Amino acid sequence: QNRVPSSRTVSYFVAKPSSSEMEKLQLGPEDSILRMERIRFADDIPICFEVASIPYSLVGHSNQTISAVQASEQIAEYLEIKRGDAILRVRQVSYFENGLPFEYVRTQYAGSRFEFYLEK
Protein backbone atom coordinates (compact mmCIF):
# COMPACT_ATOMS: atom_id res chain seq x y z
CA GLN A 1 0.00 0.00 0.00
CA ASN A 2 3.04 2.42 0.76
CA ARG A 3 1.08 4.93 2.95
CA VAL A 4 2.48 6.91 5.86
CA PRO A 5 1.13 5.62 9.15
CA SER A 6 0.21 7.74 12.16
CA SER A 7 -1.85 7.56 15.34
CA ARG A 8 -3.76 9.59 17.93
CA THR A 9 -3.90 8.44 21.57
CA VAL A 10 -7.54 9.14 22.40
CA SER A 11 -7.33 8.16 26.10
CA TYR A 12 -4.73 7.09 28.59
CA PHE A 13 -5.92 6.55 32.21
CA VAL A 14 -5.72 4.31 35.21
CA ALA A 15 -8.97 2.49 36.07
CA LYS A 16 -10.63 -0.54 37.58
CA PRO A 17 -11.11 -3.21 35.00
CA SER A 18 -14.07 -4.36 32.99
CA SER A 19 -15.21 -7.97 33.30
CA SER A 20 -13.42 -8.79 30.10
CA GLU A 21 -10.28 -7.22 31.44
CA MET A 22 -10.72 -9.20 34.74
CA GLU A 23 -11.11 -12.38 32.78
CA LYS A 24 -8.20 -11.90 30.39
CA LEU A 25 -5.78 -10.20 32.71
CA GLN A 26 -6.70 -12.57 35.64
CA LEU A 27 -7.58 -9.72 37.95
CA GLY A 28 -10.02 -8.66 40.58
CA PRO A 29 -12.37 -5.73 40.46
CA GLU A 30 -10.09 -3.77 42.81
CA ASP A 31 -6.88 -4.38 40.81
CA SER A 32 -6.08 -1.25 38.80
CA ILE A 33 -5.12 -1.44 35.09
CA LEU A 34 -3.44 1.08 32.91
CA ARG A 35 -5.33 1.56 29.70
CA MET A 36 -4.45 3.12 26.34
CA GLU A 37 -6.78 3.85 23.46
CA ARG A 38 -5.35 4.88 20.11
CA ILE A 39 -6.65 5.33 16.51
CA ARG A 40 -4.22 4.23 13.81
CA PHE A 41 -4.28 5.84 10.42
CA ALA A 42 -2.68 4.99 7.16
CA ASP A 43 -2.26 8.28 5.46
CA ASP A 44 -5.15 9.92 7.31
CA ILE A 45 -7.59 7.10 6.57
CA PRO A 46 -8.55 5.54 9.93
CA ILE A 47 -7.66 1.87 9.88
CA CYS A 48 -8.35 0.51 13.34
CA PHE A 49 -9.22 1.42 16.90
CA GLU A 50 -6.81 -0.17 19.39
CA VAL A 51 -7.32 -0.64 23.16
CA ALA A 52 -4.41 -1.91 25.28
CA SER A 53 -4.61 -2.78 28.99
CA ILE A 54 -1.77 -3.66 31.33
CA PRO A 55 -2.13 -4.22 35.03
CA TYR A 56 -0.95 -1.11 36.89
CA SER A 57 0.94 -3.24 39.31
CA LEU A 58 3.37 -4.01 36.47
CA VAL A 59 4.59 -0.45 36.51
CA GLY A 60 6.65 -15.62 27.12
CA HIS A 61 3.82 -16.69 24.80
CA SER A 62 0.81 -14.67 23.54
CA ASN A 63 -2.39 -15.68 21.75
CA GLN A 64 -5.03 -14.09 19.49
CA THR A 65 -8.63 -14.63 18.59
CA ILE A 66 -10.77 -13.07 15.89
CA SER A 67 -14.42 -12.17 16.08
CA ALA A 68 -17.13 -9.84 14.69
CA VAL A 69 -18.73 -6.99 16.64
CA GLN A 70 -21.03 -4.14 15.83
CA ALA A 71 -19.81 -0.53 15.46
CA SER A 72 -20.57 1.34 18.67
CA GLU A 73 -21.46 5.00 18.36
CA GLN A 74 -18.09 6.21 19.54
CA ILE A 75 -16.02 3.77 17.48
CA ALA A 76 -18.19 4.46 14.45
CA GLU A 77 -17.10 8.01 14.90
CA TYR A 78 -13.40 7.33 15.29
CA LEU A 79 -13.32 5.02 12.33
CA GLU A 80 -15.64 7.13 10.13
CA ILE A 81 -18.13 4.29 9.54
CA LYS A 82 -21.78 4.00 10.87
CA ARG A 83 -23.11 2.67 14.19
CA GLY A 84 -24.10 -0.89 13.54
CA ASP A 85 -21.61 -1.75 10.79
CA ALA A 86 -20.01 -5.20 11.26
CA ILE A 87 -16.39 -4.96 12.23
CA LEU A 88 -13.59 -7.48 12.68
CA ARG A 89 -12.03 -7.45 16.08
CA VAL A 90 -8.78 -9.07 17.10
CA ARG A 91 -8.18 -9.79 20.83
CA GLN A 92 -4.63 -10.54 21.90
CA VAL A 93 -3.36 -11.55 25.32
CA SER A 94 0.34 -11.76 26.15
CA TYR A 95 1.79 -13.72 29.03
CA PHE A 96 5.03 -14.13 30.89
CA GLU A 97 6.34 -17.70 31.29
CA ASN A 98 4.53 -18.29 34.62
CA GLY A 99 1.50 -17.75 32.38
CA LEU A 100 0.92 -14.46 34.17
CA PRO A 101 -1.03 -12.28 31.69
CA PHE A 102 0.38 -8.79 31.20
CA GLU A 103 -1.26 -7.19 28.20
CA TYR A 104 -4.69 -7.42 26.67
CA VAL A 105 -5.03 -5.67 23.31
CA ARG A 106 -8.24 -5.38 21.35
CA THR A 107 -8.25 -4.02 17.85
CA GLN A 108 -11.29 -3.13 15.79
CA TYR A 109 -11.11 -2.44 12.06
CA ALA A 110 -12.74 0.39 10.14
CA GLY A 111 -15.07 -1.85 8.10
CA SER A 112 -16.63 -3.86 6.71
CA ARG A 113 -14.18 -4.07 3.95
CA PHE A 114 -11.21 -5.49 5.77
CA GLU A 115 -10.55 -9.15 5.34
CA PHE A 116 -7.89 -11.35 6.72
CA TYR A 117 -6.43 -14.10 4.71
CA LEU A 118 -4.87 -17.22 5.97
CA GLU A 119 -3.20 -20.34 4.58
CA LYS A 120 -2.72 -23.92 6.00
Add this chain to the structure above:
Amino acid sequence: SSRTVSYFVAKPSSSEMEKLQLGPEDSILRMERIRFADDIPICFEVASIPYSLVSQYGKSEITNSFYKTLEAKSGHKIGHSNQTISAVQASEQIAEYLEIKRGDAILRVRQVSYFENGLPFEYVRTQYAGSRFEFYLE
Protein backbone atom coordinates in the same frame (compact mmCIF):
# COMPACT_ATOMS: atom_id res chain seq x y z
CA SER B 1 -25.22 -31.59 17.59
CA SER B 2 -25.87 -30.17 14.14
CA ARG B 3 -28.85 -29.95 11.81
CA THR B 4 -28.74 -30.20 8.03
CA VAL B 5 -30.90 -27.45 6.48
CA SER B 6 -30.31 -28.76 2.92
CA TYR B 7 -28.43 -31.18 0.67
CA PHE B 8 -28.81 -31.25 -3.11
CA VAL B 9 -26.88 -31.57 -6.34
CA ALA B 10 -26.84 -28.46 -8.58
CA LYS B 11 -24.94 -26.53 -11.21
CA PRO B 12 -22.36 -24.11 -9.71
CA SER B 13 -22.54 -20.37 -9.37
CA SER B 14 -19.59 -18.51 -10.79
CA SER B 15 -18.01 -18.29 -7.31
CA GLU B 16 -18.36 -22.00 -7.06
CA MET B 17 -16.92 -22.49 -10.61
CA GLU B 18 -14.05 -20.21 -9.80
CA LYS B 19 -13.00 -21.57 -6.42
CA LEU B 20 -13.55 -25.23 -7.47
CA GLN B 21 -11.99 -24.99 -10.98
CA LEU B 22 -15.17 -26.20 -12.62
CA GLY B 23 -16.94 -25.43 -15.85
CA PRO B 24 -20.55 -24.26 -15.71
CA GLU B 25 -22.00 -27.70 -16.38
CA ASP B 26 -20.08 -29.70 -13.72
CA SER B 27 -22.34 -30.42 -10.78
CA ILE B 28 -21.70 -29.68 -7.16
CA LEU B 29 -23.09 -31.31 -4.08
CA ARG B 30 -24.30 -28.41 -1.98
CA MET B 31 -24.81 -28.96 1.68
CA GLU B 32 -26.10 -26.60 4.35
CA ARG B 33 -25.93 -27.12 8.04
CA ILE B 34 -26.27 -25.38 11.46
CA ARG B 35 -24.13 -26.32 14.41
CA PHE B 36 -25.13 -25.86 18.05
CA ALA B 37 -23.35 -25.47 21.42
CA ASP B 38 -25.47 -25.90 24.57
CA ASP B 39 -28.38 -26.11 22.10
CA ILE B 40 -27.71 -22.51 20.94
CA PRO B 41 -26.81 -22.10 17.19
CA ILE B 42 -23.11 -21.22 16.76
CA CYS B 43 -22.61 -21.21 12.98
CA PHE B 44 -24.29 -21.70 9.63
CA GLU B 45 -22.28 -23.40 6.91
CA VAL B 46 -22.71 -23.87 3.12
CA ALA B 47 -20.31 -26.36 1.56
CA SER B 48 -19.97 -27.11 -2.15
CA ILE B 49 -17.97 -30.11 -3.30
CA PRO B 50 -17.52 -31.17 -6.93
CA TYR B 51 -19.99 -33.95 -7.45
CA SER B 52 -17.64 -36.04 -9.56
CA LEU B 53 -15.41 -36.41 -6.43
CA VAL B 54 -18.16 -37.56 -4.20
CA SER B 55 -21.08 -39.11 -6.17
CA GLN B 56 -20.23 -42.63 -5.10
CA TYR B 57 -20.18 -41.88 -1.36
CA GLY B 58 -22.68 -42.32 1.44
CA LYS B 59 -24.58 -39.29 2.53
CA SER B 60 -23.49 -39.79 6.16
CA GLU B 61 -19.78 -40.16 5.33
CA ILE B 62 -19.97 -36.93 3.33
CA THR B 63 -21.82 -35.42 6.29
CA ASN B 64 -19.85 -36.67 9.31
CA SER B 65 -16.37 -37.84 8.22
CA PHE B 66 -15.73 -36.13 4.91
CA TYR B 67 -11.99 -35.69 5.24
CA LYS B 68 -11.43 -39.25 6.56
CA THR B 69 -13.59 -40.62 3.72
CA LEU B 70 -11.48 -38.70 1.15
CA GLU B 71 -8.16 -39.76 2.66
CA ALA B 72 -9.58 -43.26 3.06
CA LYS B 73 -10.99 -43.76 -0.43
CA SER B 74 -10.24 -41.00 -2.98
CA GLY B 75 -6.61 -41.98 -3.58
CA HIS B 76 -5.56 -38.36 -3.19
CA LYS B 77 -4.36 -36.65 -0.09
CA ILE B 78 -5.43 -33.36 1.43
CA GLY B 79 -3.04 -30.49 0.65
CA HIS B 80 -3.31 -26.78 1.36
CA SER B 81 -6.36 -24.74 2.21
CA ASN B 82 -6.86 -20.99 2.44
CA GLN B 83 -9.28 -19.03 4.58
CA THR B 84 -10.69 -15.56 4.09
CA ILE B 85 -12.10 -14.01 7.23
CA SER B 86 -14.41 -11.02 7.38
CA ALA B 87 -17.17 -9.36 9.33
CA VAL B 88 -20.65 -8.92 7.85
CA GLN B 89 -24.19 -8.14 9.14
CA ALA B 90 -26.71 -10.98 9.52
CA SER B 91 -29.33 -11.11 6.76
CA GLU B 92 -32.75 -12.14 8.00
CA GLN B 93 -32.23 -15.58 6.59
CA ILE B 94 -29.04 -16.05 8.61
CA ALA B 95 -30.56 -14.42 11.70
CA GLU B 96 -33.35 -16.94 11.35
CA TYR B 97 -31.05 -19.95 11.19
CA LEU B 98 -28.76 -18.67 13.91
CA GLU B 99 -31.58 -17.29 16.12
CA ILE B 100 -30.28 -13.74 16.41
CA LYS B 101 -31.47 -10.34 15.13
CA ARG B 102 -31.02 -9.21 11.56
CA GLY B 103 -28.01 -6.92 11.44
CA ASP B 104 -26.19 -8.71 14.29
CA ALA B 105 -22.44 -9.14 13.72
CA ILE B 106 -21.44 -12.26 11.74
CA LEU B 107 -17.91 -13.56 11.55
CA ARG B 108 -17.72 -15.00 8.04
CA VAL B 109 -15.12 -17.58 7.10
CA ARG B 110 -14.67 -18.60 3.48
CA GLN B 111 -12.44 -21.49 2.74
CA VAL B 112 -11.17 -23.49 -0.24
CA SER B 113 -9.29 -26.75 0.38
CA TYR B 114 -7.12 -28.50 -2.23
CA PHE B 115 -5.71 -31.97 -2.68
CA GLU B 116 -1.90 -32.15 -2.68
CA ASN B 117 -2.07 -32.31 -6.50
CA GLY B 118 -3.82 -28.87 -6.55
CA LEU B 119 -7.42 -30.03 -7.17
CA PRO B 120 -9.97 -27.99 -5.30
CA PHE B 121 -12.32 -30.31 -3.43
CA GLU B 122 -14.47 -27.98 -1.35
CA TYR B 123 -15.59 -24.41 -0.94
CA VAL B 124 -17.03 -23.89 2.49
CA ARG B 125 -18.63 -20.66 3.66
CA THR B 126 -19.41 -20.31 7.32
CA GLN B 127 -21.31 -17.63 9.20
CA TYR B 128 -20.74 -17.51 12.94
CA ALA B 129 -22.76 -15.54 15.46
CA GLY B 130 -20.17 -12.90 16.52
CA SER B 131 -21.24 -12.69 20.18
CA ARG B 132 -21.06 -16.44 20.57
CA PHE B 133 -17.80 -17.30 18.82
CA GLU B 134 -14.11 -16.63 18.75
CA PHE B 135 -11.78 -17.84 16.04
CA TYR B 136 -8.58 -19.13 17.59
CA LEU B 137 -5.45 -18.48 15.54
CA GLU B 138 -2.80 -21.26 15.23
Add this chain to the structure above:
Amino acid sequence: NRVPSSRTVSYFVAKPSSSEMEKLQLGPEDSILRMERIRFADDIPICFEVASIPYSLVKIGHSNQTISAVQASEQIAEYLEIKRGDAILRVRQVSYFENGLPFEYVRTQYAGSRFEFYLEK
Protein backbone atom coordinates in the same frame (compact mmCIF):
# COMPACT_ATOMS: atom_id res chain seq x y z
CA ASN C 1 -5.13 -8.58 4.85
CA ARG C 2 -2.42 -10.35 6.88
CA VAL C 3 -3.35 -10.62 10.52
CA PRO C 4 -1.41 -8.22 12.65
CA SER C 5 -0.04 -8.99 16.08
CA SER C 6 2.42 -7.33 18.46
CA ARG C 7 4.92 -8.15 21.15
CA THR C 8 5.63 -5.64 23.94
CA VAL C 9 9.37 -5.93 24.55
CA SER C 10 9.59 -3.56 27.46
CA TYR C 11 7.33 -1.32 29.46
CA PHE C 12 8.78 0.85 32.24
CA VAL C 13 9.04 4.13 34.11
CA ALA C 14 12.34 5.81 33.50
CA LYS C 15 14.21 9.01 33.47
CA PRO C 16 14.16 10.57 29.96
CA SER C 17 16.83 10.55 27.30
CA SER C 18 17.90 13.76 25.63
CA SER C 19 15.40 13.48 22.81
CA GLU C 20 12.63 12.54 25.20
CA MET C 21 13.49 15.70 27.20
CA GLU C 22 13.56 17.70 24.05
CA LYS C 23 10.34 16.43 22.43
CA LEU C 24 8.31 16.08 25.61
CA GLN C 25 9.67 19.32 27.08
CA LEU C 26 10.85 17.79 30.28
CA GLY C 27 13.86 17.99 32.55
CA PRO C 28 16.10 15.03 33.55
CA GLU C 29 14.30 14.36 36.82
CA ASP C 30 10.89 14.14 35.09
CA SER C 31 9.91 10.46 34.63
CA ILE C 32 8.29 8.96 31.53
CA LEU C 33 6.37 5.80 30.84
CA ARG C 34 8.05 4.04 27.95
CA MET C 35 6.66 1.14 25.99
CA GLU C 36 8.47 -0.72 23.25
CA ARG C 37 6.63 -3.08 20.86
CA ILE C 38 7.41 -5.10 17.78
CA ARG C 39 4.52 -5.10 15.33
CA PHE C 40 4.14 -8.04 12.99
CA ALA C 41 1.96 -8.85 10.01
CA ASP C 42 1.55 -12.61 9.78
CA ASP C 43 4.63 -13.03 11.98
CA ILE C 44 6.82 -10.94 9.76
CA PRO C 45 8.22 -8.04 11.70
CA ILE C 46 7.20 -4.75 10.16
CA CYS C 47 8.21 -2.09 12.67
CA PHE C 48 9.67 -1.44 16.09
CA GLU C 49 7.84 1.22 17.98
CA VAL C 50 8.92 3.08 21.13
CA ALA C 51 6.35 5.38 22.79
CA SER C 52 6.91 7.66 25.74
CA ILE C 53 4.45 9.60 27.86
CA PRO C 54 5.17 11.92 30.79
CA TYR C 55 4.53 9.71 33.83
CA SER C 56 2.79 12.57 35.51
CA LEU C 57 0.12 12.56 32.80
CA VAL C 58 -1.45 9.73 34.73
CA LYS C 59 -8.37 17.43 24.79
CA ILE C 60 -5.96 16.59 21.96
CA GLY C 61 -4.93 17.36 18.40
CA HIS C 62 -2.58 18.41 16.99
CA SER C 63 0.41 16.24 16.24
CA ASN C 64 3.18 16.15 13.74
CA GLN C 65 5.56 13.85 12.02
CA THR C 66 9.03 13.52 10.73
CA ILE C 67 10.88 10.97 8.67
CA SER C 68 14.47 10.14 8.42
CA ALA C 69 16.75 7.25 8.12
CA VAL C 70 18.79 5.43 10.61
CA GLN C 71 21.10 2.49 10.88
CA ALA C 72 19.75 -0.70 12.38
CA SER C 73 21.32 -1.11 15.81
CA GLU C 74 22.03 -4.68 16.91
CA GLN C 75 19.06 -4.80 19.28
CA ILE C 76 16.78 -3.58 16.52
CA ALA C 77 18.32 -5.72 13.72
CA GLU C 78 17.52 -8.67 15.84
CA TYR C 79 13.98 -7.55 16.69
CA LEU C 80 13.19 -6.98 13.05
CA GLU C 81 15.20 -9.85 11.46
CA ILE C 82 17.58 -7.66 9.43
CA LYS C 83 21.40 -6.90 9.71
CA ARG C 84 23.15 -4.41 12.07
CA GLY C 85 23.87 -1.37 9.92
CA ASP C 86 21.07 -1.75 7.37
CA ALA C 87 19.48 1.62 6.50
CA ILE C 88 15.93 1.90 7.80
CA LEU C 89 13.21 4.47 7.70
CA ARG C 90 12.39 6.05 11.04
CA VAL C 91 9.22 8.10 11.72
CA ARG C 92 8.82 10.38 14.70
CA GLN C 93 5.51 11.61 16.01
CA VAL C 94 4.90 14.04 18.88
CA SER C 95 1.33 14.65 19.93
CA TYR C 96 0.30 17.88 21.78
CA PHE C 97 -2.70 19.12 23.81
CA GLU C 98 -4.43 22.32 22.53
CA ASN C 99 -2.31 24.37 24.96
CA GLY C 100 0.93 23.15 23.21
CA LEU C 101 1.94 20.70 25.99
CA PRO C 102 3.54 17.61 24.48
CA PHE C 103 2.09 14.40 25.76
CA GLU C 104 3.44 11.53 23.68
CA TYR C 105 6.53 10.86 21.64
CA VAL C 106 6.56 7.83 19.38
CA ARG C 107 9.35 6.58 17.24
CA THR C 108 8.69 3.95 14.62
CA GLN C 109 11.52 2.21 12.92
CA TYR C 110 10.87 -0.10 9.91
CA ALA C 111 12.18 -3.54 8.98
CA GLY C 112 14.38 -2.95 5.93
CA SER C 113 15.40 -1.22 3.79
CA ARG C 114 12.92 -2.32 1.28
CA PHE C 115 10.17 -0.20 2.77
CA GLU C 116 8.98 2.94 0.99
CA PHE C 117 6.42 5.68 1.49
CA TYR C 118 4.67 7.47 -1.23
CA LEU C 119 3.27 11.05 -0.95
CA GLU C 120 1.19 13.14 -3.44
CA LYS C 121 0.69 17.01 -3.72
Add this chain to the structure above:
Amino acid sequence: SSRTVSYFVAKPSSSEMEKLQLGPEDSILRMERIRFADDIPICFEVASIPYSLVSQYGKSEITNSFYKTLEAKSGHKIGHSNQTISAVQASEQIAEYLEIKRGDAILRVRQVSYFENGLPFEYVRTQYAGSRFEFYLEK
Protein backbone atom coordinates in the same frame (compact mmCIF):
# COMPACT_ATOMS: atom_id res chain seq x y z
CA SER D 1 24.93 27.85 0.45
CA SER D 2 24.70 25.35 -2.39
CA ARG D 3 27.27 23.98 -4.83
CA THR D 4 26.63 22.70 -8.38
CA VAL D 5 28.79 19.59 -8.75
CA SER D 6 27.80 19.03 -12.41
CA TYR D 7 25.60 20.47 -15.09
CA PHE D 8 25.11 19.29 -18.65
CA VAL D 9 22.74 18.17 -21.34
CA ALA D 10 22.23 14.48 -22.03
CA LYS D 11 19.88 12.21 -23.83
CA PRO D 12 17.75 10.65 -21.17
CA SER D 13 18.24 7.30 -19.47
CA SER D 14 15.33 4.80 -19.26
CA SER D 15 14.10 5.92 -15.89
CA GLU D 16 14.42 9.49 -17.10
CA MET D 17 12.36 8.68 -20.23
CA GLU D 18 9.71 6.97 -18.18
CA LYS D 19 9.31 9.63 -15.40
CA LEU D 20 9.66 12.68 -17.64
CA GLN D 21 7.69 10.92 -20.37
CA LEU D 22 10.19 11.50 -23.08
CA GLY D 23 11.47 9.54 -25.98
CA PRO D 24 15.07 8.66 -26.38
CA GLU D 25 16.55 11.66 -28.17
CA ASP D 26 14.63 14.27 -26.17
CA SER D 27 17.45 16.03 -24.36
CA ILE D 28 17.26 16.68 -20.66
CA LEU D 29 19.32 19.01 -18.48
CA ARG D 30 20.98 17.04 -15.78
CA MET D 31 22.33 18.76 -12.74
CA GLU D 32 23.85 17.56 -9.49
CA ARG D 33 24.01 19.69 -6.43
CA ILE D 34 25.12 19.65 -2.73
CA ARG D 35 23.38 21.93 -0.15
CA PHE D 36 24.88 22.95 3.18
CA ALA D 37 23.55 24.22 6.51
CA ASP D 38 26.12 25.99 8.70
CA ASP D 39 28.73 24.76 6.20
CA ILE D 40 27.91 21.10 6.73
CA PRO D 41 26.40 19.33 3.71
CA ILE D 42 22.81 18.22 4.31
CA CYS D 43 22.05 16.69 0.93
CA PHE D 44 22.94 15.71 -2.61
CA GLU D 45 20.39 16.07 -5.36
CA VAL D 46 20.30 14.91 -8.97
CA ALA D 47 17.77 16.78 -11.04
CA SER D 48 16.71 16.10 -14.61
CA ILE D 49 14.60 18.63 -16.56
CA PRO D 50 13.41 18.26 -20.17
CA TYR D 51 15.86 20.41 -22.09
CA SER D 52 13.17 21.87 -24.31
CA LEU D 53 11.45 23.64 -21.38
CA VAL D 54 14.66 25.25 -20.28
CA SER D 55 16.81 26.02 -23.36
CA GLN D 56 16.03 29.66 -23.02
CA TYR D 57 16.73 30.20 -19.35
CA GLY D 58 20.21 30.81 -18.08
CA LYS D 59 22.07 28.70 -15.57
CA SER D 60 21.45 30.98 -12.56
CA GLU D 61 17.69 30.99 -13.11
CA ILE D 62 17.72 27.24 -13.46
CA THR D 63 19.94 26.69 -10.45
CA ASN D 64 18.51 29.20 -7.94
CA SER D 65 15.06 30.30 -9.19
CA PHE D 66 13.72 27.26 -10.93
CA TYR D 67 10.15 27.35 -9.75
CA LYS D 68 9.93 31.18 -9.86
CA THR D 69 11.50 31.30 -13.30
CA LEU D 70 9.30 28.55 -14.64
CA GLU D 71 6.04 30.23 -13.66
CA ALA D 72 7.21 33.79 -14.40
CA LYS D 73 8.03 32.59 -17.96
CA SER D 74 6.77 29.27 -19.30
CA GLY D 75 3.09 30.20 -19.34
CA HIS D 76 2.24 27.14 -17.25
CA LYS D 77 1.45 26.49 -13.64
CA ILE D 78 3.25 24.11 -11.36
CA GLY D 79 0.68 21.28 -10.77
CA HIS D 80 0.89 18.07 -8.77
CA SER D 81 4.02 16.39 -7.47
CA ASN D 82 4.72 12.98 -6.00
CA GLN D 83 7.45 11.60 -3.79
CA THR D 84 8.79 8.21 -2.80
CA ILE D 85 10.73 8.12 0.43
CA SER D 86 13.12 5.31 1.28
CA ALA D 87 16.21 4.65 3.32
CA VAL D 88 19.55 3.65 1.77
CA GLN D 89 23.20 3.23 2.76
CA ALA D 90 25.65 5.93 1.58
CA SER D 91 27.79 4.94 -1.41
CA GLU D 92 31.50 5.79 -1.38
CA GLN D 93 30.71 8.63 -3.74
CA ILE D 94 27.78 10.10 -1.80
CA ALA D 95 29.81 9.63 1.34
CA GLU D 96 32.64 11.79 -0.13
CA TYR D 97 30.11 14.43 -1.18
CA LEU D 98 28.17 14.50 2.07
CA GLU D 99 31.28 14.15 4.25
CA ILE D 100 30.10 10.99 5.98
CA LYS D 101 31.13 7.28 5.73
CA ARG D 102 30.25 4.50 3.18
CA GLY D 103 27.42 2.66 4.94
CA ASP D 104 25.86 5.65 6.68
CA ALA D 105 22.13 6.12 6.64
CA ILE D 106 20.52 8.07 3.78
CA LEU D 107 16.99 9.29 3.48
CA ARG D 108 16.19 9.15 -0.19
CA VAL D 109 13.51 11.09 -1.86
CA ARG D 110 12.69 10.68 -5.48
CA GLN D 111 10.18 13.07 -6.91
CA VAL D 112 8.39 13.85 -10.19
CA SER D 113 6.63 17.21 -10.58
CA TYR D 114 4.07 18.15 -13.16
CA PHE D 115 2.42 21.13 -14.76
CA GLU D 116 -1.28 21.73 -14.09
CA ASN D 117 -1.65 20.33 -17.58
CA GLY D 118 -0.14 16.93 -16.63
CA LEU D 119 3.34 17.42 -18.28
CA PRO D 120 6.36 16.30 -16.20
CA PHE D 121 8.98 18.94 -15.74
CA GLU D 122 11.28 17.55 -13.09
CA TYR D 123 12.70 14.22 -11.91
CA VAL D 124 14.58 14.88 -8.73
CA ARG D 125 16.45 12.39 -6.64
CA THR D 126 17.76 13.57 -3.38
CA GLN D 127 19.91 11.90 -0.84
CA TYR D 128 19.93 13.45 2.71
CA ALA D 129 22.38 12.59 5.50
CA GLY D 130 20.06 10.78 7.90
CA SER D 131 21.60 12.13 11.06
CA ARG D 132 21.56 15.70 9.84
CA PHE D 133 18.07 15.72 8.43
CA GLU D 134 14.37 15.33 9.10
CA PHE D 135 11.62 15.46 6.48
CA TYR D 136 8.52 17.19 7.78
CA LEU D 137 5.21 15.72 6.71
CA GLU D 138 2.87 18.39 5.32
CA LYS D 139 0.13 19.12 7.92
